[PDB]
A paper describes a structure:
A relative displacement of the C helix in the CDK1-cyclin B-Cks2 complexes compared with CDK2-cyclin A is consistent with that reported previously (Martin et al., 2017, Brown et al., 2015), being far smaller than the displacement that accompanies cyclin binding and accommodated without affecting contacts made to the inhibitors described here. However, binding of the inhibitor to either of the cyclin-bound CDKs is less entropically unfavorable than binding to the corresponding cyclin-free CDK, suggesting that cyclin binding pre-organizes the CDK moiety so that inhibitor binding carries a lower entropic penalty. Our structural data show that cyclin-bound CDK1 and CDK2 form the two conserved hydrophobic spines. In total, these elements form 133 and 145 inter-lobe contacts (<4.0 Å) for CDK1-cyclin B and CDK2-cyclin A, respectively.
Members of the cyclin-dependent protein kinase (CDK) family have diverse cellular roles that include regulation of the cell cycle and transcription and, in certain cell types, differentiation (Lim and Kaldis, 2013, Malumbres, 2014, Morgan, 2007). CDKs share a conserved protein kinase domain that comprises a smaller N-terminal lobe linked through a hinge to a larger C-terminal fold (Endicott et al., 2012). All CDKs require binding to a cognate cyclin partner to remould the kinase fold from an inactive conformation to one capable of phospho-transfer. We have used biophysical measurements and X-ray crystallography to investigate the ATP-competitive inhibitor binding properties of cyclin-free and cyclin-bound CDK1 and CDK2.
Numbering used by the authors:
A (entry chain A): 0 to 35, 41 to 298
B (entry chain B): 171 to 432
The structure:
């Protein structure tokens, strides 16, 4: 229980509760402690049950659950910071490309492992992607995740933090699947390169229009079924699709190829995390430590 | 389609096969319960079927809750007056895991007709989480069935519904069905449904996916055929009632075949 833990400082906070840095007094291990009516919340039930199954080097490790009459603590391995903080700290240097590549490779490994174990993450924003001083990056916060079936069955709609939300969610499709998480990582790949969110919308319609302005307004040819989708409107402006080299100018040819396959409109055609691991962008991938103190 | 996860369905299947062995209840537990019987359990499960109808819950939710109850009862001795409290907390946990809109705790107290308080239900929720060590993502018959249905040539809605119905019937009787894994009951239910409706058999493509043959499926298949033949006379009827509905293509009104010709 908590007698062996010494709190150090607050590191994070949303509706879920609050997260502290702490240390195990007996082993020295540094941890994150997340402290949490209708009884135990569904987000915590999902987070704990799914994370108990997911042991992978690019998934944050749940070490323990301390379950009291009054409170629930989740104990995680400690990571130093989120990717958002690191992007900001790299403001006028940029993030060196070997690090971007290493980070994306790791994120795809973590995600493919989720998908292989029937888990959709559904909130891959940079605040949920944690980095340590050794060069690792890991998926965190599985509160919004879900165990899926094959084939998928209708799940919660309008999921995913809006800037990272896939068009099939924005257009209200009856089903969505693993491709939603790849859309998000695509948005993250772009963002690691520019340090700016690729599609920073303020409402669902503005998010769609920003997507359309960058990738072209989709039509039956590019995305069969699109004009029949529940929230498609035949009044939607028709923007031409804009050369990918203009979308993320510093990206080479391989990078551009992988980004375009991660941001494909048709969720059937979009690349899987598993297949992305073999993309020629990663031909020279390594695992360097981050270039800044964390 | 990505809705059928082509790049992951095989990994997922292998993983569920691995998990169903680890999540498996103790086959002999009911003998070691001093106060409850297979027939009290049959009553609870049939009651959960109705609760699921009343609140429009997913079939997956029902199957999960039964998995929790059986795993719980495998280590915890329970008096008859408390069985329904275990079952209610289980259905609550299954709903929070699996449903978009779980019913509130007050609704779970109300369908027990105030046999238990909100405080008892919530205390039991925590006990069930503690006994299962939050291991709630359990494989079900349903999760294997939906993958098996992708091998139909072509899709037949009556086959699907009837296979679900038969899978569901298996939940009511601990004897014999505690001795079979979810993947095996689903396979027997799928074969039996396919044969009742179309005259066809367990396809070669599913022999390739699962390693199961009509030979490995025979013991479960004989049990399931009897359960199907006797369903009209079973003391518990909620599943038959439910599967009369057009949602499930009235499949409980279909006649079981007299023989299987194995
Ligand atoms: C919600 C949640 N559940 C568990 C964690 C979690 C797990 C392990 N390590 C950390 N470490 C950490 C996070 C954020 C920052 S920050 C905002 O100051 O850059 C600094 C360190 N956090 N989390 C995170 C996502 C808050």
């Amino acid at each position: 229980s908590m007698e062996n833990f010494q709190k150090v400082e607050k590191i994070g906070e949303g509706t879920y509760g609050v997260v502290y840095k702490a240390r195990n007094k007996l082993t020295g291990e540094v941890v994150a402690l997340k402290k949490i009516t209708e009884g135990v919340p569904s987000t915590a039930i999902r987070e704990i049950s799914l994370l108990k199954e997911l042991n992978h080097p690019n998934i944050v490790k749940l070490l323990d659950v301390i379950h009291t009459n009054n409170k629930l603590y989740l104990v995680f391995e400690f990571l130093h910071q989120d990717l958002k903080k690191f992007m900001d700290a790299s403001a006028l240097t940029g993030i060196p490309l070997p690090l971007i590549k290493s980070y994306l490779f790791q994120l795809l490994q973590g995600l493919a492992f989720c998908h292989s174990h029937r888990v959709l993450h559904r909130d891959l924003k940079p605040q949920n992607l944690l980095i340590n001083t050794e060069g690792a990056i890991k998926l965190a916060d599985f509160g919004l995740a879900r165990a899926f079936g094959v084939p998928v069955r209708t799940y919660t709609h309008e999921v995913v933090t809006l800037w990272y939300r896939a068009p099939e969610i924005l257009l209200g499709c009856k089903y969505y699947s693993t491709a939603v998480d790849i859309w998000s990582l695509g948005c993250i790949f772009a963002e690691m390169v520019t340090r700016r969110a690729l599609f920073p919308g303020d409402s669902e319609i503005d998010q769609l229009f920003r997507i359309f302005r960058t990738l072209g307004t989709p039509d039956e040819v590019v995305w069969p079924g699109v004009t029949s989708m529940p929230d498609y409107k035949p009044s939607f402006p028709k923007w031409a699709r804009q050369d990918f080299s203009k979308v993320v100018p510093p990206l080479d040819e391989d990078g551009r190829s992988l980004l375009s396959q991660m941001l494909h409109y048709d969720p059937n055609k979009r690349i899987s995390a598993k297949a992305a691991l073999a993309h020629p962008f990663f031909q020279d991938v390594t695992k360097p430590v981050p270039h800044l103190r964390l | 389609s990505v809705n059928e996860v082509p790049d992951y369905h095989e990994d997922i299947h292998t993983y569920l096969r691995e998990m169903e062995v680890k999540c498996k209840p103790k086959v002999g537990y009911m003998k070691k319960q001093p106060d409850i019987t297979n027939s009290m359990r049959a009553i609870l499960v049939d009651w959960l079927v109705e609760v699921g109808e009343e609140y429009k819950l997913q079939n997956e939710t029902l199957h999960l809750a039964v998995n929790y109850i059986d795993r719980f009862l495998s280590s915890m001795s329970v008096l008859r007056g408390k069985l329904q409290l275990v079952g209610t907390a289980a259905m609550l946990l299954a709903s929070k895991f699996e449903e978009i809109y779980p019913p509130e705790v007050a609704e779970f107290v109300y369908i027990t007709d105030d046999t238990y308080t909100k405080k008892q239900v919530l205390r039991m929720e925590h006990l069930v989480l503690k006994v299962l060590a939050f291991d709630l993502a359990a494989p079900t018959i349903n999760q294997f069935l939906t993958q098996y249905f992708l091998h139909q040539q072509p899709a037949n809605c009556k086959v699907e519904s009837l296979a679900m119905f038969l899978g569901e019937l298996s939940l009511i009787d601990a004897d014999p069905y505690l001795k079979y894994l979810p993947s095996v009951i689903a396979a027997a239910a799928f074969h039996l449904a396919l044969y009742t409706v179309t005259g066809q058999s367990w396809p070669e493509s599913l022999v390739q996916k699962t390693g199961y043959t009509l030979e490995t499926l025979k013991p479960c298949l004989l049990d399931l055929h009897q359960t199907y033949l006797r369903a009209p006379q079973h003391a518990q009827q909620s599943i038959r009632e439910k599967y009369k509905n057009s949602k499930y293509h009235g499949v409980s009104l279909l006649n079981p075949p007299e023989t299987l010709n194995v």
